[PDB]
Amino acid sequence: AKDAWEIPRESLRLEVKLGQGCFGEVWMGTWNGTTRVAIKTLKPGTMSPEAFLQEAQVMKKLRHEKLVQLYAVVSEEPIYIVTEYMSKGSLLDFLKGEMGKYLRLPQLVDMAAQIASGMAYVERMNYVHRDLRAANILVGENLVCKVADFGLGAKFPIKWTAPEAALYGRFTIKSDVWSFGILLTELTTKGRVPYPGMVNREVLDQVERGYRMPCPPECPESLHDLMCQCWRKDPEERPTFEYLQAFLEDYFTSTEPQYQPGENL
Ligand SMILES: Cc1ccc(NC(=O)c2ccc(CN3CCN(C)CC3)cc2)cc1Nc1nccc(-c2cccnc2)n1
């Protein structure tokens, strides 16, 4: 009964409450009085410990510079899960906030490449995300982006979920690629909700019949084409994250070498 990830309760200090749920809370804090960190709590009773510590177990095996890193854990109720802190918050909040007005296509595509890199790691390790979207991406200094999962049948983010997954429960790394496509629209519209003006029911009927969001204003058609590849009716058709990462990293030389800054992108 000795785990290296275990830390003493006295070493943690919850300073600012960041959110709540029926299962627990999230806070910004300090570890060992030197490291700022994010802290997730388990509300006693609501959910079973082991069902909760499952996540921490997964995070113990995953390690990549573009994936939120598990720092420590307090495995005996009340349980605490500790990770690195990301100075700029969710990508979604960053995108629509004061910073959103200054971000241009070169920055937004670099952020996508990083997310793609994080997802390419998830892909190589054979895991599935199931809720990839801007609200689950964290932003740090110098625009570093990392994939996370705030755990935000039950609530279904239909607008971000591939049809085969939202209808028939088939969640795979390919349904995540579909989500990445949607994420690219959030990036190019500065965090706007996808399928504007459409409720879940119509989004389901529409995509079902082949509908796909059009090219966002000032967004090069070549990037919209990437989105469409991500939204291919057939999972296998969809590109891999390894492909997506390389395509985005090389984007301004191989695909859009004549790129010129506009008003918003
Ligand atoms: C405190 C904590 C506890 C757990 C996690 N967990 C994850 O981010 C995560 C990422 C990937 C997986 C992999 N998993 C594979 C299987 N499929 C089905 C689900 C995903 C699991 C958990 C993050 C955090 N960090 C966190 N949580 C909420 C908000 C913030 C935060 C807010 C503002 C600034 N900086 C950080 N930080």
Side-chain angles (χ1 to χ4, degrees):
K2 309 171 187 177
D3 187 299
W5 294 97
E6 274 290 321
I7 57 168
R9 298 176 184 278
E10 326 82 58
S11 63
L12 274 182
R13 290 185 307 185
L14 296 290
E15 305 172 359
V16 177
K17 193 177 182 180
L18 303 182
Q20 270 189 298
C22 63
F23 290 166
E25 304 166 46
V26 168
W27 291 68
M28 176 204 85
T30 303
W31 176 33
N32 298 309
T34 59
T35 318
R36 192 164 311 303
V37 301
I39 306 167
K40 186 178 182 183
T41 304
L42 169 64
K43 198 176 191 300
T46 64
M47 190 175 124
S48 64
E50 286 196 55
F52 189 75
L53 293 179
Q54 282 183 53
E55 162 172 41
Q57 290 306 75
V58 173
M59 296 180 76
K60 291 181 180 183
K61 284 119 74 178
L62 300 174
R63 201 181 211 76
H64 186 278
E65 70 176 300
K66 302 304 179 180
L67 219 188
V68 178
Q69 186 60 52
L70 171 67
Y71 273 8
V73 301
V74 179
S75 56
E76 288 177 57
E77 296 187 300
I79 288 85
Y80 293 76
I81 297 187
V82 190
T83 69
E84 54 178 327
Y85 190 69
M86 300 295 289
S87 60
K88 284 128 82 172
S90 79
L91 174 57
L92 183 56
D93 301 348
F94 187 71
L95 242 28
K96 51 221 305 288
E98 165 182 50
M99 277 305 312
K101 75 202 308 296
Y102 302 116
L103 297 168
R104 287 297 178 274
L105 210 276
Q107 290 77 44
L108 301 160
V109 164
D110 170 78
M111 300 179 90
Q114 299 184 63
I115 298 176
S117 178
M119 283 311 291
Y121 172 73
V122 169
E123 187 175 69
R124 296 194 295 276
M125 298 295 277
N126 294 138
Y127 282 81
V128 183
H129 188 300
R130 306 183 79 183
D131 196 26
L132 181 61
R133 56 185 165 180
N136 272 319
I137 300 292
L138 288 173
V139 181
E141 226 60 36
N142 196 191
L143 295 68
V144 166
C145 289
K146 304 192 184 192
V147 178
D149 188 18
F150 313 140
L152 304 176
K155 276 296 179 297
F156 231 113
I158 146 75
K159 295 177 187 184
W160 282 269
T161 307
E164 78 277 2
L167 285 178
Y168 310 125
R170 190 163 63 275
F171 285 83
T172 65
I173 185 71
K174 291 303 188 183
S175 49
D176 283 334
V177 168
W178 173 290
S179 299
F180 186 78
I182 303 296
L183 213 164
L184 289 169
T185 68
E186 302 185 273
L187 275 166
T188 54
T189 59
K190 302 297 166 54
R192 277 293 221 148
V193 175
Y195 305 101
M198 295 173 69
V199 298
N200 290 325
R201 201 59 49 61
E202 31 182 347
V203 173
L204 276 177
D205 298 315
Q206 290 300 89
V207 303
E208 153 203 60
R209 280 179 280 78
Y211 177 83
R212 296 293 187 275
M213 289 183 274
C215 187
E218 299 191 12
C219 175
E221 187 52 44
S222 63
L223 185 58
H224 176 243
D225 289 329
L226 192 69
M227 296 169 190
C228 291
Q229 286 167 56
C230 291
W231 307 327
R232 278 164 173 159
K233 169 84 170 189
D234 197 304
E236 285 55 59
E237 286 186 283
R238 275 115 71 170
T240 66
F241 279 107
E242 179 184 58
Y243 172 80
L244 290 162
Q245 181 188 338
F247 178 98
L248 299 168
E249 297 178 321
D250 288 8
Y251 193 77
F252 294 97
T253 299
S254 312
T255 313
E256 220 62 56
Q258 68 317 298
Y259 166 77
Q260 225 51 283
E263 277 294 294
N264 296 282
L265 292 171

PDB file of all heavy atoms in Angstrom, residues 18 26 38-40 55 58-59 62 67-68 81-90 127-130 138 147-150, ligand 1:
ATOM      1  N   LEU A  18     -12.965  26.795  -9.126  1.00  0.00           N
ATOM      2  CA  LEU A  18     -13.133  27.004 -10.559  1.00  0.00           C
ATOM      3  C   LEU A  18     -14.429  26.431 -11.117  1.00  0.00           C
ATOM      4  O   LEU A  18     -14.871  26.831 -12.193  1.00  0.00           O
ATOM      5  CB  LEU A  18     -11.944  26.404 -11.314  1.00  0.00           C
ATOM      6  CG  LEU A  18     -10.565  26.931 -10.907  1.00  0.00           C
ATOM      7  CD1 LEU A  18      -9.497  26.288 -11.776  1.00  0.00           C
ATOM      8  CD2 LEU A  18     -10.524  28.445 -11.046  1.00  0.00           C
ATOM      9  N   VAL A  26     -13.655  21.532  -8.702  1.00  0.00           N
ATOM     10  CA  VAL A  26     -12.362  21.775  -9.328  1.00  0.00           C
ATOM     11  C   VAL A  26     -11.849  23.088  -8.761  1.00  0.00           C
ATOM     12  O   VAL A  26     -12.609  24.039  -8.614  1.00  0.00           O
ATOM     13  CB  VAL A  26     -12.467  21.888 -10.861  1.00  0.00           C
ATOM     14  CG1 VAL A  26     -11.163  22.424 -11.426  1.00  0.00           C
ATOM     15  CG2 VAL A  26     -12.766  20.517 -11.461  1.00  0.00           C
ATOM     16  N   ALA A  38      -3.968  22.379 -10.624  1.00  0.00           N
ATOM     17  CA  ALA A  38      -5.409  22.254 -10.766  1.00  0.00           C
ATOM     18  C   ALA A  38      -5.760  21.102  -9.832  1.00  0.00           C
ATOM     19  O   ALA A  38      -4.980  20.159  -9.703  1.00  0.00           O
ATOM     20  CB  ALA A  38      -5.784  21.914 -12.212  1.00  0.00           C
ATOM     21  N   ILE A  39      -6.919  21.182  -9.182  1.00  0.00           N
ATOM     22  CA  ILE A  39      -7.337  20.154  -8.235  1.00  0.00           C
ATOM     23  C   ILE A  39      -8.790  19.716  -8.397  1.00  0.00           C
ATOM     24  O   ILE A  39      -9.708  20.531  -8.320  1.00  0.00           O
ATOM     25  CB  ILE A  39      -7.148  20.656  -6.791  1.00  0.00           C
ATOM     26  CG1 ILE A  39      -5.707  21.132  -6.597  1.00  0.00           C
ATOM     27  CG2 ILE A  39      -7.496  19.549  -5.799  1.00  0.00           C
ATOM     28  CD1 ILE A  39      -5.485  21.919  -5.325  1.00  0.00           C
ATOM     29  N   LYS A  40      -8.992  18.420  -8.605  1.00  0.00           N
ATOM     30  CA  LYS A  40     -10.329  17.869  -8.762  1.00  0.00           C
ATOM     31  C   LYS A  40     -10.693  17.076  -7.510  1.00  0.00           C
ATOM     32  O   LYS A  40      -9.911  16.249  -7.040  1.00  0.00           O
ATOM     33  CB  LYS A  40     -10.387  16.959  -9.986  1.00  0.00           C
ATOM     34  CG  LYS A  40     -11.774  16.446 -10.313  1.00  0.00           C
ATOM     35  CD  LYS A  40     -11.763  15.594 -11.575  1.00  0.00           C
ATOM     36  CE  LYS A  40     -13.166  15.129 -11.924  1.00  0.00           C
ATOM     37  NZ  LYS A  40     -13.180  14.230 -13.109  1.00  0.00           N
ATOM     38  N   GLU A  55      -9.927   7.274 -13.462  1.00  0.00           N
ATOM     39  CA  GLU A  55      -9.350   8.347 -14.258  1.00  0.00           C
ATOM     40  C   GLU A  55      -7.885   8.578 -13.895  1.00  0.00           C
ATOM     41  O   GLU A  55      -7.029   8.683 -14.773  1.00  0.00           O
ATOM     42  CB  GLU A  55     -10.148   9.639 -14.057  1.00  0.00           C
ATOM     43  CG  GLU A  55      -9.405  10.894 -14.472  1.00  0.00           C
ATOM     44  CD  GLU A  55     -10.282  12.126 -14.450  1.00  0.00           C
ATOM     45  OE1 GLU A  55     -11.083  12.272 -13.503  1.00  0.00           O
ATOM     46  OE2 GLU A  55     -10.160  12.955 -15.376  1.00  0.00           O
ATOM     47  N   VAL A  58      -5.696   6.030 -15.382  1.00  0.00           N
ATOM     48  CA  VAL A  58      -5.449   6.227 -16.802  1.00  0.00           C
ATOM     49  C   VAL A  58      -4.373   7.290 -16.983  1.00  0.00           C
ATOM     50  O   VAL A  58      -3.453   7.132 -17.784  1.00  0.00           O
ATOM     51  CB  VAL A  58      -6.721   6.688 -17.531  1.00  0.00           C
ATOM     52  CG1 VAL A  58      -6.399   7.038 -18.968  1.00  0.00           C
ATOM     53  CG2 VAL A  58      -7.768   5.595 -17.477  1.00  0.00           C
ATOM     54  N   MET A  59      -4.492   8.370 -16.222  1.00  0.00           N
ATOM     55  CA  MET A  59      -3.538   9.462 -16.304  1.00  0.00           C
ATOM     56  C   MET A  59      -2.136   9.057 -15.863  1.00  0.00           C
ATOM     57  O   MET A  59      -1.158   9.702 -16.232  1.00  0.00           O
ATOM     58  CB  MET A  59      -4.040  10.648 -15.480  1.00  0.00           C
ATOM     59  CG  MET A  59      -5.335  11.236 -16.026  1.00  0.00           C
ATOM     60  SD  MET A  59      -5.959  12.622 -15.079  1.00  0.00           S
ATOM     61  CE  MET A  59      -4.835  13.924 -15.615  1.00  0.00           C
ATOM     62  N   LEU A  62      -0.569   7.711 -19.132  1.00  0.00           N
ATOM     63  CA  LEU A  62      -0.421   8.663 -20.230  1.00  0.00           C
ATOM     64  C   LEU A  62       0.563   9.787 -19.918  1.00  0.00           C
ATOM     65  O   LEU A  62       0.466  10.437 -18.881  1.00  0.00           O
ATOM     66  CB  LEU A  62      -1.787   9.249 -20.593  1.00  0.00           C
ATOM     67  CG  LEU A  62      -2.830   8.221 -21.046  1.00  0.00           C
ATOM     68  CD1 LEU A  62      -4.175   8.895 -21.228  1.00  0.00           C
ATOM     69  CD2 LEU A  62      -2.375   7.561 -22.345  1.00  0.00           C
ATOM     70  N   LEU A  67      -0.690  16.818 -23.511  1.00  0.00           N
ATOM     71  CA  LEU A  67      -1.755  16.173 -22.754  1.00  0.00           C
ATOM     72  C   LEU A  67      -1.600  16.619 -21.305  1.00  0.00           C
ATOM     73  O   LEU A  67      -0.508  16.525 -20.753  1.00  0.00           O
ATOM     74  CB  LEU A  67      -1.601  14.655 -22.835  1.00  0.00           C
ATOM     75  CG  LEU A  67      -2.856  13.796 -22.968  1.00  0.00           C
ATOM     76  CD1 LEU A  67      -2.457  12.332 -22.836  1.00  0.00           C
ATOM     77  CD2 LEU A  67      -3.870  14.164 -21.905  1.00  0.00           C
ATOM     78  N   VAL A  68      -2.677  17.114 -20.697  1.00  0.00           N
ATOM     79  CA  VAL A  68      -2.628  17.571 -19.309  1.00  0.00           C
ATOM     80  C   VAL A  68      -1.943  16.492 -18.469  1.00  0.00           C
ATOM     81  O   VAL A  68      -2.319  15.328 -18.517  1.00  0.00           O
ATOM     82  CB  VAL A  68      -4.052  17.846 -18.762  1.00  0.00           C
ATOM     83  CG1 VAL A  68      -3.988  18.280 -17.306  1.00  0.00           C
ATOM     84  CG2 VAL A  68      -4.710  18.940 -19.590  1.00  0.00           C
ATOM     85  N   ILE A  81      -7.371  14.789  -7.019  1.00  0.00           N
ATOM     86  CA  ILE A  81      -6.550  14.490  -8.196  1.00  0.00           C
ATOM     87  C   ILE A  81      -5.885  15.820  -8.552  1.00  0.00           C
ATOM     88  O   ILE A  81      -6.557  16.848  -8.664  1.00  0.00           O
ATOM     89  CB  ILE A  81      -7.406  13.968  -9.372  1.00  0.00           C
ATOM     90  CG1 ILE A  81      -8.071  12.651  -8.968  1.00  0.00           C
ATOM     91  CG2 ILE A  81      -6.535  13.753 -10.607  1.00  0.00           C
ATOM     92  CD1 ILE A  81      -8.817  11.938 -10.085  1.00  0.00           C
ATOM     93  N   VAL A  82      -4.563  15.808  -8.702  1.00  0.00           N
ATOM     94  CA  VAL A  82      -3.812  17.027  -8.987  1.00  0.00           C
ATOM     95  C   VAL A  82      -3.069  16.985 -10.328  1.00  0.00           C
ATOM     96  O   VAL A  82      -2.423  15.993 -10.668  1.00  0.00           O
ATOM     97  CB  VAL A  82      -2.788  17.300  -7.856  1.00  0.00           C
ATOM     98  CG1 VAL A  82      -2.184  18.677  -8.011  1.00  0.00           C
ATOM     99  CG2 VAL A  82      -3.465  17.178  -6.495  1.00  0.00           C
ATOM    100  N   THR A  83      -3.160  18.074 -11.082  1.00  0.00           N
ATOM    101  CA  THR A  83      -2.496  18.161 -12.379  1.00  0.00           C
ATOM    102  C   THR A  83      -1.817  19.516 -12.537  1.00  0.00           C
ATOM    103  O   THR A  83      -1.956  20.391 -11.689  1.00  0.00           O
ATOM    104  CB  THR A  83      -3.505  18.007 -13.543  1.00  0.00           C
ATOM    105  OG1 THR A  83      -4.354  19.161 -13.595  1.00  0.00           O
ATOM    106  CG2 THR A  83      -4.371  16.772 -13.352  1.00  0.00           C
ATOM    107  N   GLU A  84      -1.074  19.682 -13.624  1.00  0.00           N
ATOM    108  CA  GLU A  84      -0.425  20.956 -13.901  1.00  0.00           C
ATOM    109  C   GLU A  84      -1.522  22.002 -14.085  1.00  0.00           C
ATOM    110  O   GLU A  84      -2.679  21.663 -14.333  1.00  0.00           O
ATOM    111  CB  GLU A  84       0.391  20.863 -15.188  1.00  0.00           C
ATOM    112  CG  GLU A  84      -0.431  20.371 -16.370  1.00  0.00           C
ATOM    113  CD  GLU A  84       0.360  20.333 -17.659  1.00  0.00           C
ATOM    114  OE1 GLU A  84       1.255  21.180 -17.851  1.00  0.00           O
ATOM    115  OE2 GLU A  84       0.075  19.454 -18.487  1.00  0.00           O
ATOM    116  N   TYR A  85      -1.153  23.269 -13.954  1.00  0.00           N
ATOM    117  CA  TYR A  85      -2.090  24.371 -14.122  1.00  0.00           C
ATOM    118  C   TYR A  85      -1.802  25.011 -15.481  1.00  0.00           C
ATOM    119  O   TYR A  85      -0.652  25.067 -15.909  1.00  0.00           O
ATOM    120  CB  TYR A  85      -1.897  25.410 -13.011  1.00  0.00           C
ATOM    121  CG  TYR A  85      -2.983  26.466 -12.983  1.00  0.00           C
ATOM    122  CD1 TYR A  85      -4.286  26.134 -12.612  1.00  0.00           C
ATOM    123  CD2 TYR A  85      -2.723  27.783 -13.369  1.00  0.00           C
ATOM    124  CE1 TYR A  85      -5.307  27.081 -12.625  1.00  0.00           C
ATOM    125  CE2 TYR A  85      -3.741  28.742 -13.390  1.00  0.00           C
ATOM    126  CZ  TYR A  85      -5.030  28.381 -13.017  1.00  0.00           C
ATOM    127  OH  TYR A  85      -6.054  29.303 -13.050  1.00  0.00           O
ATOM    128  N   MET A  86      -2.840  25.493 -16.156  1.00  0.00           N
ATOM    129  CA  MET A  86      -2.667  26.122 -17.464  1.00  0.00           C
ATOM    130  C   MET A  86      -3.161  27.563 -17.388  1.00  0.00           C
ATOM    131  O   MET A  86      -4.358  27.836 -17.445  1.00  0.00           O
ATOM    132  CB  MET A  86      -3.434  25.328 -18.518  1.00  0.00           C
ATOM    133  CG  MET A  86      -2.971  23.870 -18.648  1.00  0.00           C
ATOM    134  SD  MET A  86      -1.270  23.718 -19.261  1.00  0.00           S
ATOM    135  CE  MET A  86      -1.504  24.229 -21.006  1.00  0.00           C
ATOM    136  N   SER A  87      -2.206  28.477 -17.250  1.00  0.00           N
ATOM    137  CA  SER A  87      -2.451  29.910 -17.098  1.00  0.00           C
ATOM    138  C   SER A  87      -3.591  30.594 -17.857  1.00  0.00           C
ATOM    139  O   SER A  87      -4.163  31.555 -17.348  1.00  0.00           O
ATOM    140  CB  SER A  87      -1.155  30.676 -17.382  1.00  0.00           C
ATOM    141  OG  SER A  87      -0.688  30.423 -18.699  1.00  0.00           O
ATOM    142  N   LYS A  88      -3.933  30.126 -19.054  1.00  0.00           N
ATOM    143  CA  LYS A  88      -4.985  30.797 -19.810  1.00  0.00           C
ATOM    144  C   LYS A  88      -6.368  30.153 -19.845  1.00  0.00           C
ATOM    145  O   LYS A  88      -7.261  30.631 -20.546  1.00  0.00           O
ATOM    146  CB  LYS A  88      -4.479  31.093 -21.232  1.00  0.00           C
ATOM    147  CG  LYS A  88      -3.513  32.283 -21.255  1.00  0.00           C
ATOM    148  CD  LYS A  88      -2.189  31.985 -21.947  1.00  0.00           C
ATOM    149  CE  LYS A  88      -2.289  32.117 -23.468  1.00  0.00           C
ATOM    150  NZ  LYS A  88      -0.955  32.007 -24.147  1.00  0.00           N
ATOM    151  N   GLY A  89      -6.565  29.085 -19.081  1.00  0.00           N
ATOM    152  CA  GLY A  89      -7.876  28.450 -19.054  1.00  0.00           C
ATOM    153  C   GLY A  89      -8.273  27.643 -20.281  1.00  0.00           C
ATOM    154  O   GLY A  89      -7.425  27.240 -21.079  1.00  0.00           O
ATOM    155  N   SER A  90      -9.570  27.402 -20.437  1.00  0.00           N
ATOM    156  CA  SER A  90     -10.050  26.617 -21.567  1.00  0.00           C
ATOM    157  C   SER A  90      -9.838  27.372 -22.876  1.00  0.00           C
ATOM    158  O   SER A  90      -9.871  28.602 -22.904  1.00  0.00           O
ATOM    159  CB  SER A  90     -11.536  26.274 -21.405  1.00  0.00           C
ATOM    160  OG  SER A  90     -12.365  27.371 -21.750  1.00  0.00           O
ATOM    161  N   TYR A 127      -6.163   4.751 -27.292  1.00  0.00           N
ATOM    162  CA  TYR A 127      -7.230   5.201 -26.413  1.00  0.00           C
ATOM    163  C   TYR A 127      -8.205   6.012 -27.253  1.00  0.00           C
ATOM    164  O   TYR A 127      -7.921   6.346 -28.401  1.00  0.00           O
ATOM    165  CB  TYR A 127      -6.698   6.079 -25.277  1.00  0.00           C
ATOM    166  CG  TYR A 127      -6.044   5.319 -24.150  1.00  0.00           C
ATOM    167  CD1 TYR A 127      -4.730   4.875 -24.257  1.00  0.00           C
ATOM    168  CD2 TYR A 127      -6.741   5.049 -22.970  1.00  0.00           C
ATOM    169  CE1 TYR A 127      -4.118   4.182 -23.219  1.00  0.00           C
ATOM    170  CE2 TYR A 127      -6.137   4.352 -21.920  1.00  0.00           C
ATOM    171  CZ  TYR A 127      -4.823   3.923 -22.057  1.00  0.00           C
ATOM    172  OH  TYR A 127      -4.208   3.230 -21.041  1.00  0.00           O
ATOM    173  N   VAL A 128      -9.359   6.313 -26.676  1.00  0.00           N
ATOM    174  CA  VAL A 128     -10.372   7.107 -27.350  1.00  0.00           C
ATOM    175  C   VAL A 128     -10.653   8.269 -26.414  1.00  0.00           C
ATOM    176  O   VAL A 128     -10.567   8.115 -25.192  1.00  0.00           O
ATOM    177  CB  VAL A 128     -11.668   6.303 -27.562  1.00  0.00           C
ATOM    178  CG1 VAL A 128     -12.682   7.148 -28.333  1.00  0.00           C
ATOM    179  CG2 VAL A 128     -11.365   5.020 -28.313  1.00  0.00           C
ATOM    180  N   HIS A 129     -10.975   9.436 -26.962  1.00  0.00           N
ATOM    181  CA  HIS A 129     -11.251  10.563 -26.087  1.00  0.00           C
ATOM    182  C   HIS A 129     -12.736  10.582 -25.781  1.00  0.00           C
ATOM    183  O   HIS A 129     -13.135  10.464 -24.619  1.00  0.00           O
ATOM    184  CB  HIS A 129     -10.813  11.885 -26.728  1.00  0.00           C
ATOM    185  CG  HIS A 129     -10.906  13.062 -25.805  1.00  0.00           C
ATOM    186  ND1 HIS A 129     -12.095  13.470 -25.235  1.00  0.00           N
ATOM    187  CD2 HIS A 129      -9.961  13.921 -25.355  1.00  0.00           C
ATOM    188  CE1 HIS A 129     -11.878  14.529 -24.479  1.00  0.00           C
ATOM    189  NE2 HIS A 129     -10.592  14.825 -24.534  1.00  0.00           N
ATOM    190  N   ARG A 130     -13.543  10.716 -26.832  1.00  0.00           N
ATOM    191  CA  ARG A 130     -15.004  10.742 -26.742  1.00  0.00           C
ATOM    192  C   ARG A 130     -15.621  12.128 -26.514  1.00  0.00           C
ATOM    193  O   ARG A 130     -16.824  12.299 -26.685  1.00  0.00           O
ATOM    194  CB  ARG A 130     -15.503   9.760 -25.665  1.00  0.00           C
ATOM    195  CG  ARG A 130     -14.978   8.334 -25.851  1.00  0.00           C
ATOM    196  CD  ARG A 130     -15.539   7.371 -24.815  1.00  0.00           C
ATOM    197  NE  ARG A 130     -16.890   6.938 -25.147  1.00  0.00           N
ATOM    198  CZ  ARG A 130     -17.626   6.144 -24.379  1.00  0.00           C
ATOM    199  NH1 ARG A 130     -17.139   5.695 -23.225  1.00  0.00           N
ATOM    200  NH2 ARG A 130     -18.846   5.792 -24.767  1.00  0.00           N
ATOM    201  N   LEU A 138      -6.931  22.971 -22.877  1.00  0.00           N
ATOM    202  CA  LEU A 138      -6.399  23.980 -21.969  1.00  0.00           C
ATOM    203  C   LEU A 138      -5.299  24.763 -22.674  1.00  0.00           C
ATOM    204  O   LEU A 138      -4.582  24.228 -23.513  1.00  0.00           O
ATOM    205  CB  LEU A 138      -5.850  23.326 -20.688  1.00  0.00           C
ATOM    206  CG  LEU A 138      -6.904  22.765 -19.725  1.00  0.00           C
ATOM    207  CD1 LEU A 138      -6.251  21.997 -18.578  1.00  0.00           C
ATOM    208  CD2 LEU A 138      -7.723  23.923 -19.175  1.00  0.00           C
ATOM    209  N   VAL A 147      -4.572  18.734 -24.528  1.00  0.00           N
ATOM    210  CA  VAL A 147      -5.824  18.008 -24.501  1.00  0.00           C
ATOM    211  C   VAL A 147      -6.138  17.615 -23.058  1.00  0.00           C
ATOM    212  O   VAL A 147      -5.260  17.168 -22.318  1.00  0.00           O
ATOM    213  CB  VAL A 147      -5.717  16.728 -25.362  1.00  0.00           C
ATOM    214  CG1 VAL A 147      -7.013  15.932 -25.290  1.00  0.00           C
ATOM    215  CG2 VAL A 147      -5.385  17.101 -26.807  1.00  0.00           C
ATOM    216  N   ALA A 148      -7.391  17.792 -22.659  1.00  0.00           N
ATOM    217  CA  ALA A 148      -7.821  17.434 -21.315  1.00  0.00           C
ATOM    218  C   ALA A 148      -9.199  16.805 -21.424  1.00  0.00           C
ATOM    219  O   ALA A 148      -9.738  16.656 -22.517  1.00  0.00           O
ATOM    220  CB  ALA A 148      -7.884  18.686 -20.418  1.00  0.00           C
ATOM    221  N   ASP A 149      -9.766  16.427 -20.289  1.00  0.00           N
ATOM    222  CA  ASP A 149     -11.099  15.848 -20.286  1.00  0.00           C
ATOM    223  C   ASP A 149     -11.731  16.138 -18.934  1.00  0.00           C
ATOM    224  O   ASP A 149     -11.544  15.387 -17.982  1.00  0.00           O
ATOM    225  CB  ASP A 149     -11.032  14.340 -20.545  1.00  0.00           C
ATOM    226  CG  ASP A 149     -12.404  13.728 -20.754  1.00  0.00           C
ATOM    227  OD1 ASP A 149     -13.350  14.492 -21.034  1.00  0.00           O
ATOM    228  OD2 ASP A 149     -12.539  12.488 -20.654  1.00  0.00           O
ATOM    229  N   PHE A 150     -12.468  17.243 -18.857  1.00  0.00           N
ATOM    230  CA  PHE A 150     -13.114  17.646 -17.612  1.00  0.00           C
ATOM    231  C   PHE A 150     -14.360  16.829 -17.292  1.00  0.00           C
ATOM    232  O   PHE A 150     -15.135  17.195 -16.405  1.00  0.00           O
ATOM    233  CB  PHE A 150     -13.484  19.130 -17.662  1.00  0.00           C
ATOM    234  CG  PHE A 150     -12.379  20.014 -18.168  1.00  0.00           C
ATOM    235  CD1 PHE A 150     -12.656  21.072 -19.026  1.00  0.00           C
ATOM    236  CD2 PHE A 150     -11.062  19.794 -17.783  1.00  0.00           C
ATOM    237  CE1 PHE A 150     -11.636  21.896 -19.494  1.00  0.00           C
ATOM    238  CE2 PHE A 150     -10.033  20.615 -18.249  1.00  0.00           C
ATOM    239  CZ  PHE A 150     -10.325  21.666 -19.106  1.00  0.00           C
TER     240      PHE A 150
HETATM  241  C1  LIG B   1      -7.673  18.435 -11.715  1.00  0.00           C
HETATM  242  C2  LIG B   1      -7.784  17.541 -12.974  1.00  0.00           C
HETATM  243  C3  LIG B   1      -8.158  16.167 -12.796  1.00  0.00           C
HETATM  244  C4  LIG B   1      -8.274  15.282 -13.926  1.00  0.00           C
HETATM  245  C5  LIG B   1      -8.021  15.746 -15.256  1.00  0.00           C
HETATM  246  N1  LIG B   1      -8.157  14.802 -16.329  1.00  0.00           N
HETATM  247  C6  LIG B   1      -7.973  14.995 -17.694  1.00  0.00           C
HETATM  248  O1  LIG B   1      -7.855  16.092 -18.239  1.00  0.00           O
HETATM  249  C7  LIG B   1      -7.935  13.777 -18.576  1.00  0.00           C
HETATM  250  C8  LIG B   1      -7.393  13.819 -19.940  1.00  0.00           C
HETATM  251  C9  LIG B   1      -7.393  12.620 -20.752  1.00  0.00           C
HETATM  252  C10 LIG B   1      -7.933  11.380 -20.200  1.00  0.00           C
HETATM  253  C11 LIG B   1      -7.990  10.063 -20.990  1.00  0.00           C
HETATM  254  N2  LIG B   1      -9.294   9.330 -21.055  1.00  0.00           N
HETATM  255  C12 LIG B   1      -9.186   8.065 -21.903  1.00  0.00           C
HETATM  256  C13 LIG B   1     -10.539   7.293 -21.965  1.00  0.00           C
HETATM  257  N3  LIG B   1     -11.629   8.221 -22.494  1.00  0.00           N
HETATM  258  C14 LIG B   1     -12.891   7.473 -22.599  1.00  0.00           C
HETATM  259  C15 LIG B   1     -11.746   9.472 -21.645  1.00  0.00           C
HETATM  260  C16 LIG B   1     -10.386  10.218 -21.581  1.00  0.00           C
HETATM  261  C17 LIG B   1      -8.455  11.374 -18.850  1.00  0.00           C
HETATM  262  C18 LIG B   1      -8.458  12.537 -18.056  1.00  0.00           C
HETATM  263  C19 LIG B   1      -7.642  17.140 -15.446  1.00  0.00           C
HETATM  264  C20 LIG B   1      -7.524  18.027 -14.343  1.00  0.00           C
HETATM  265  N4  LIG B   1      -7.151  19.360 -14.581  1.00  0.00           N
HETATM  266  C21 LIG B   1      -8.092  20.384 -14.710  1.00  0.00           C
HETATM  267  N5  LIG B   1      -9.455  20.165 -14.624  1.00  0.00           N
HETATM  268  C22 LIG B   1     -10.357  21.211 -14.750  1.00  0.00           C
HETATM  269  C23 LIG B   1      -9.891  22.536 -14.970  1.00  0.00           C
HETATM  270  C24 LIG B   1      -8.468  22.723 -15.054  1.00  0.00           C
HETATM  271  C25 LIG B   1      -7.813  24.046 -15.272  1.00  0.00           C
HETATM  272  C26 LIG B   1      -8.550  25.298 -15.333  1.00  0.00           C
HETATM  273  C27 LIG B   1      -7.871  26.546 -15.541  1.00  0.00           C
HETATM  274  C28 LIG B   1      -6.443  26.527 -15.687  1.00  0.00           C
HETATM  275  N6  LIG B   1      -5.743  25.314 -15.624  1.00  0.00           N
HETATM  276  C29 LIG B   1      -6.372  24.099 -15.426  1.00  0.00           C
HETATM  277  N7  LIG B   1      -7.629  21.637 -14.920  1.00  0.00           N
END
